[PDB]
Design a binder for this molecule. Structure first.
Ligand code: ZN
Lengths: 36, 258, 279, 63, 42, 94, 50, 50
């Protein structure tokens, strides 16, 4: 009953390095960019 | 000052010593030979049936790995815009028996596999294989299948080994045993590095004092080899042509800017 | 030895371009494009012609362009006469492999291919179950080239992810003519204490030169210094390192570069099956 | 799986020297000399033929 | 339209059960279609 | 091979060279270093991933020559050298 | 890791980078035109960059 | 067509868009940081090394 009742846009993938992008930038795969 | 000295001419390969240039240019040459100088190779294959022990993709890739004769006297291999001329290398076989590269039918007697003894795929009973691979001109930079061959070069250096170094005779003997030019005098021995010369650890303690290495400015030893697609001399020729054409194109772009 | 799982990569140890830092690993483009480290993924879907107790049945037929659960469009473009694909027909997205048709209590429920999967059909068997119901098993293969993000690891717990695929042209070469297949950052060695990997590199070099396969059995394998002392008489610096030239500019680096042949294994952690997004 | 047609690092023809390699070693002739008698310069290209497995002689006997 | 374990094809349809009426075998194989198949050789 | 002008200044030119790689870029730079009037001549590829691959050149002179002329000079040097080398080359196989 | 090793090599007592190296690689950063690059501290052994 | 002002487009990710990068386990706050999308091919997230 009652005393037993009240009781009881994203993505994910591998990461790769990139010292050629800005420190605040993030590399996002364009396929992921086409879904999000 | 430009000068060559062909050391050896082998079956579709060559070893030589370029002198009077420098690092930059020699790299332009080599990189161009690898990634620019075009050949013929299978781009795509249209399979009609494949009951062989391999997948369509594997076989197709292997077909792309087969060196195809590239006639330099028929096509502009120095062109920046290559011809989209298509060659049809077809085949219809049936097991049992092994399929070689020499079994391939060509739509052009000038464009065939350079080597007919390359194992493709083994066919067993009732295993048919019918396809018409399309071959085009391509560059190594887009896919390594189109690479005409390989080039490796090093600084042409002289190794001075003072006779103050215990057992220098062994170094001399090693050099002669490996085919490196040895010069002897009233002091040390000079070894010409037309190839890598790895000194013994036994002698690594003399690295500096009695033993020292000097680079010959501008002189590099190269080794160029192909697969049968192109004559080995022709590849170098075409590379140089590519250099010239690239620079020319660049100036053409410069004039239309100002 | 009769059924291995990996390849001998001629690995070079240096940080190039700074794309192999933090366990990352750099790969020769050409080598990949020539076969090295390529693999195929396999996944078989099944479809059992269930017979409902009520008397109704499924029957695998091409779902007639009607109503009830119908996907519409040419998602059924690949289906045949019986609503089953034929081999070597490119599969992708929510493509229908077998056209089902379950009655009321008629829906679709046709088995479609997984989301982040594609590729080509290989075998389409067909048979019966113990129930005496027509069973269809269709397997799909997916060509998988070692792309950016895939996981690689040697037999020394030295796991790493492909950080960048650099063209063989930019790839540095040794005076002997050797071009690296996999370049590991030199920062992933002194911190960890894995001498066996370096010794394995030297052993693979000797093995490649001599022709011997070399015995590295625990406790009873050649003491490292012997492979080091043999490697030279084979014609190579004892130190596992050689002279390498910078493929970009051209001057040879003012140091020696430890190059070896270490056996790398491709793990089943392919980025193709890790990436996914939510709308 | 039948000798990686050509090579990986050194990417030149090598499949065409499979049979005679194997058969030459299958008499006692040390591979490290057999290879030398054939077009086997660098070890990178040599490795591809040294450590090969030819699993295909199992797989065909199927479908 | 079929095959089984080490022999030849069969005809289409069905009504009672499915075993190869040429081998007595139970498994059927859909052979690859002999049509055109372009495999992009990379 | 297209030249995308990034920025122009008095005796200064920054631009992208579409369709080019390390080969021609590097060769052109090191060739550009021979002109004593060229104060600066460098390139880098702030994009090593996409298909672009295109580089970024920057050439700065001292006023006694425009960057454009210096570039023409460099490419001309390249052309002449490659031709000479080719002639020796063919004139070797003997 | 490499940032540390690179900072060391770049700021070493014996750190002399020929024009080829300095000029071509400063493009990994920026900042030159006039009174930045100047003026080559060492021309003793050879004209070089500390 | 005549979209007129006031509509709304769901455009693909552009270079520079605000985006949160996250790695579990999320110990300190520094585990979730705002980044600037720089759209690139292949199939991994690129993180600048520092
Ligand atoms: Zn090799």
């Amino acid at each position: 009953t009652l005393a037993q009742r009240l009781k009881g846009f994203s993505a994910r993938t591998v990461i790769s390095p990139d010292p050629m992008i800005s420190i605040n930038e993030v590399g996002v795969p364009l396929a992921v960019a086409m879904e999000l | 000052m430009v000068e060559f000295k062909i050391l050896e001419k082998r079956p579709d390969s060559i070893k030589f010593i370029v002198s009077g240039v420098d690092v930059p240019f020699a790299n332009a040459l080599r990189r161009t030979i690898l990634s620019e100088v075009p050949t013929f190779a299978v781009d795509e294959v249209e399979f009609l049936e494949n009951d062989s022990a391999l997948f369509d993709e594997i076989i197709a890739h292997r077909l792309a790995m087969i060196p195809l004769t590239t006639p330099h006297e028929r096509f502009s291999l120095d062109a920046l815009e290559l011809d989209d001329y298509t060659v049809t290398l077809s085949l219809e076989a049936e097991g049992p028996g092994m399929v070689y590269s020499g079994d391939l039918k060509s739509s052009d007697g000038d464009v065939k596999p350079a080597n007919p003894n390359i194992p493709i795929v083994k066919l067993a009973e009732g295993q048919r294989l019918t396809f018409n691979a399309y071959a085009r001109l391509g560059r190594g930079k887009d896919h390594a299948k189109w690479q005409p061959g390989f080039v490796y070069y090093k600084y042409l250096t002289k190794i001075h080994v003072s006779k103050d170094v215990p057992d220098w005779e062994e170094l001399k003997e090693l050099a002669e045993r490996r085919g490196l030019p040895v010069e002897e005098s009233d002091e040390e021995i000079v070894i010409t590095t037309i190839k890598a010369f790895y000194l013994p650890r036994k002698f690594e303690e003399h690295m500096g004092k009695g033993i020292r290495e000097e680079i010959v400015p501008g002189s590099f030893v190269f080794t160029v080899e192909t697969n049968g697609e192109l004559p080995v001399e022709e590849i170098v020729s075409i590379a140089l042509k590519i250099l010239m054409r690239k620079s020319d194109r660049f100036i053409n772009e410069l004039h239309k800017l100002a | 030895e009769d059924r291995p799982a990996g390849q001998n990569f001629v690995v070079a140890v240096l940080s190039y371009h700074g794309y192999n830092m933090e366990d990352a690993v750099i790969i020769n483009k050409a080598s990949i494009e020539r076969g090295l480290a390529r693999s195929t993924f396999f996944r078989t879907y099944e479809a059992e012609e269930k017979r409902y107790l009520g008397g109704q049945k499924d029957n695998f037929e091409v779902p007639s362009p009607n109503i009830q659960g119908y996907l519409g469009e040419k998602y059924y473009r690949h289906l045949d006469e019986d609503g089953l694909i034929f081999p070597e027909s490119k599969v992708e997205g929510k493509d229908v492999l077998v056209g089902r048709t379950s009655p009321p209590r008629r829906r679709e429920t046709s088995v479609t291919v997984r989301p982040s999967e594609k590729g080509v059909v290989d075998k389409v068997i067909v048979t019966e179950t113990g129930d005496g119901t027509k069973l269809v098993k269709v397997t799909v293969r997916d060509l998988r080239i070692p792309e950016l993000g895939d996981k690689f690891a040697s037999r020394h717990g030295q796991k790493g992810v492909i950080g960048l695929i650099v063209p063989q042209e930019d790839m540095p070469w040794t005076e002997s003519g050797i071009v690296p297949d996999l370049i590991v950052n030199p920062h992933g060695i002194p911190s960890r204490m894995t001498v066996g990997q370096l010794i394995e590199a030297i052993g693979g070099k000797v093995a490649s030169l001599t022709g011997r396969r070399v015995d590295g059995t625990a406790f009873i394998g050649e003491p490292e210094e012997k492979l080091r002392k043999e490697l030279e008489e084979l014609g190579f610096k004892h130190s596992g390192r050689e002279i390498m030239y910078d493929g970009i500019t051209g001057r040879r680096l003012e140091a020696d570069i430890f190059i070896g042949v270490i056996y790398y294994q491709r793990l089943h952690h392919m980025v193709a099956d890790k990436m996914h997004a939510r709308s | 799986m039948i000798v990686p047609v050509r090579c990986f690092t050194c990417g030149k023809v090598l499949a065409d020297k499979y049979y005679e390699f194997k058969k030459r070693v299958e008499a006692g002739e040390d591979p490290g000399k057999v290879l030398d008698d054939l077009g086997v310069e660098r070890y990178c290209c040599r490795r591809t033929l040294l450590s090969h497995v030819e699993l295909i002689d199992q797989v065909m006997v199927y479908k | 339209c079929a095959k089984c374990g080490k022999e030849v094809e069969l005809d289409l349809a069905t009504a009672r059960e499915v075993r190869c009426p040429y081998c007595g075998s139970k498994i059927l194989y859909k052979p690859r279609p002999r049509v055109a198949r372009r495999v992009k050789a990379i | 091979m297209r030249i995308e002008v990034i920025r122009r200044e008095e005796n200064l030119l920054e631009f992208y060279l579409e369709g080019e790689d390390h080969t021609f870029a590097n060769l052109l730079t090191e060739t550009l270093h021979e002109n004593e009037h060229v104060t600066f001549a460098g390139y880098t590829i702030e994009h090593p991933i996409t298909m672009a691959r295109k580089p970024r050149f920057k050439v700065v002179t001292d006023g006694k020559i425009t960057p454009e002329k210096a570039l023409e000079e460099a490419a001309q040097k390249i052309f002449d050298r490659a031709r000479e080398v080719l002639e020796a080359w063919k004139a070797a196989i003997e | 890791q490499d940032h540390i090793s690179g900072g060391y090599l770049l700021t070493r007592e014996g750190a002399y980078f020929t024009r080829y190296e300095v000029e071509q690689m400063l493009m990994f950063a920026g900042m030159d035109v006039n009174e930045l690059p100047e003026p080559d501290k060492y021309e003793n052994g050879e004209p070089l960059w500390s | 067509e005549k979209l007129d002002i006031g509509w709304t487009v769901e455009r693909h990710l552009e270079d520079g868009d605000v985006v949160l990068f996250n790695r579990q386990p999320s110990l300190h706050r520094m585990s979730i940081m705002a980044h600037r999308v720089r759209v690139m091919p292949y199939r991994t997230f690129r993180l600048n090394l520092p």
